[PDB]
Task: inverse folding
């Protein structure tokens, strides 16, 4: 006849119990991440559920090598976390989508619903990349559906990273890739943002589609490009010599935004120590220098900007202030009950505390 | 809100493909049967699904390391009921994919083309083997499933097979209370001889059945003393003692069903000699309602059938349920034993021989 659900759920529960304690059920392989942590797993289960692991295990058994697999070697184009791998392996074992622990897929804004904020998008990106590398089509489709449902609410700067990973996944994520391309074309993303966030192929494709649809594709000023290249090389004296000609201004070139977004901390610091640019100036996307400083999560940049008269009460076109951006850019792990817990870099927490201080000031 | 059926079905399909090709997915253990065949299985799957396998593998890993070096002897951990290979395959398929797999036709099927193979002996034997495997492996879902399978059928099974079903139900402990109680009720309701109970069931089971038969008002006749002497002389294979007991004129082989006893439970040569004495009616019917030819067909020994026919055995007689000796020999033998493929794991061919002898005798009406 058809399917018997009771036996299927019993099988799923037994295999999930196997995954929960793999050492009590004769685990014979280990998957080591790029950080240093490792997860124990069994060769048969993952050789059956995924073709990638079957091929990798058949290749590893040919050298007569307890088998360890470096995740940083097989999947090389995206640094995946630990909880994403745990979720993917839980689905591999029990056919059940295990939810992530609180904090990983959640930001530091208690007002944020954690649906479209950056930590959740990053977790979904990691899980989708893992499902693509492991060649699990159901997980691929499910998480592509998730990102397609949420992408209309995520900010454009994160949609750029979503488009990047969608192109990384090739033809397996056609829907998400085309949707992100359409969203980026319809929006007013700077050419510098596209150049520094996307490979040359994507930039050329988006520019061709923008010029084909008759959209606004303005060229870059040559002298402004010279100032940008001078800033990218950390040559402040070159910026001084370029400004001596008075052909360009740091406000019309958004040199502060560029230095805060992409350049080094010391380069932006030395550029600010000259005082030849409006600190509260905006950009074609509507962000001020403090907003980009919040997006970068560098405490010294925010501090030096506040010591220069940066107004922190100004909002973006979407209604987000610098504190909101800083909270929604950091995950909740870095701001909760003060345990050790990997720690990562407490730079985002420092930025959040700086901006919360400036709030009540 | 609800279980995901597609993901669970894909999981079951993947693990069924694992079971169908264990060596392709790094099998690390081998279950060897009593005959000598091997089934390659993985330790993790059976340690998860079966608590028995987990407890056994935790102790087996104490001693033991090269290439697929873990072996489990089924003849030792079972050691209470000889289990075939197809039933083990079915149980392992349910362990891996959580779905029941029907055995190849012939294991649970008899050689009678008119039989529906619902209650014949091969089907009952396969059900009992799978039930015993589920009991030993500690799987309650399979236990209940096959208990219900046997319970729905037991009312249409011949009582002599109900004896074996009750034996297994007693073996399987309290995990088959319904089956055991129903089988005990069926046995005490019928008029099964005390000798058959003694030779087919343990002492405590026979004592319980006799106690309930006595307390329920049903008659339990006293075992005739001299008949017991004849039965004991036949069981020890002393035809001279049987001759001495018959020389006292106090006994009669027909009144004791000595031919039935010798054909059912004694050796071939003892029954042959007792038949050569020519001191008993060959077509005599026992209290159960069977003739000596029916008992010979149940025993599946061709020499006894030939010696019976050469002595005057009528093959056209039927039992209480309407079965002739040919139909009994058909429904008692597996269908694979009479197939057009003798190299399919050779088995005793005495059943096919008896069936064909009775078919040839039936052709000369
Ligand atoms: Cl809250
Ligand atoms: Cl809000
Ligand atoms: Cl929200
Ligand atoms: Cl962001
Ligand atoms: Cl059997
Ligand atoms: Zn959030
Ligand atoms: Zn049958």
Result:
């Amino acid at each position: 006849t058809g399917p018997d659900v009771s036996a299927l759920q019993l099988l799923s529960n037994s295999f999930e119990s196997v995954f929960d304690s793999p050492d009590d059920f004769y685990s014979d392989a280990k998957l080591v991440l790029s950080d240093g942590r490792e997860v124990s797993f069994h060769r048969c289960v993952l050789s059956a559920r995924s073709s990638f692991f079957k091929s990798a295990l058949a290749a590893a058994k040919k050298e007569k090598d307890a088998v360890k697999l470096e995740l940083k070697e097989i999947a090389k184009d995206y640094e995946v976390g630990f909880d994403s791998v745990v979720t993917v392996l839980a689905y591999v074992y029990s056919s059940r989508v295990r939810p992530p622990p609180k904090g990983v897929s959640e930001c530091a804004d208690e007002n944020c619903c954690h649906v479209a904020c950056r930590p959740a998008v990053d977790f979904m990106l990691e899980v989708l990349y893992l499902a693509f590398i492991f060649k699990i089509p159901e997980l691929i489709t499910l998480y592509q559906r998730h990102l397609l449902d949420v992408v209309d609410k995520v900010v454009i700067e994160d949609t750029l990273v979503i488009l990047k990973l969608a192109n990384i996944c090739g033809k397996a994520c056609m829907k998400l890739l085309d949707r992100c391309k359409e969203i980026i074309v319809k929006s007013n993303v700077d050419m510098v943002s596209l150049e520094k966030s996307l490979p040359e192929e994507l930039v050329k494709e988006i520019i061709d589609r923008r010029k084909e649809l008759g959209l606004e594709v303005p060229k870059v000023k040559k002298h402004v490009s010279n100032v940008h290249k001078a800033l990218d090389s950390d040559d402040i004296e070159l910026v001084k010599l370029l400004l001596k000609e008075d052909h360009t201004n740091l406000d019309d070139a958004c040199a502060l935004h560029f230095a805060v977004a992409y350049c080094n901390v010391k380069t932006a610091t030395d550029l600010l120590k000259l005082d030849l640019a409006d600190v509260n100036h905006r950009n074609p996307r509507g962000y001020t220098v403090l907003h980009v400083a919040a997006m970068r999560k560098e405490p010294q940049l925010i501090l030096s900007l506040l010591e220069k008269g940066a107004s922190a009460s100004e909002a973006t076109l979407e209604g987000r202030t610098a504190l909101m951006i800083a909270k929604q850019a950091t995950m909740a792990v870095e701001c909760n009950n003060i345990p050790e817990q990997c720690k990562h870099s407490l730079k985002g927490r420092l930025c959040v505390e700086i901006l919360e201080q400036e709030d009540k000031r």
Remarks:
- Residues A 111 surround chloride ion (ligand 2) (CB under 6 Å).
- The first strand of chain A starts at residue 29 and ends at 32.
- The longest helix of chain A spans residues 5-20.
- Strands of chain A lie at 29-32, 38-41, 68-70.
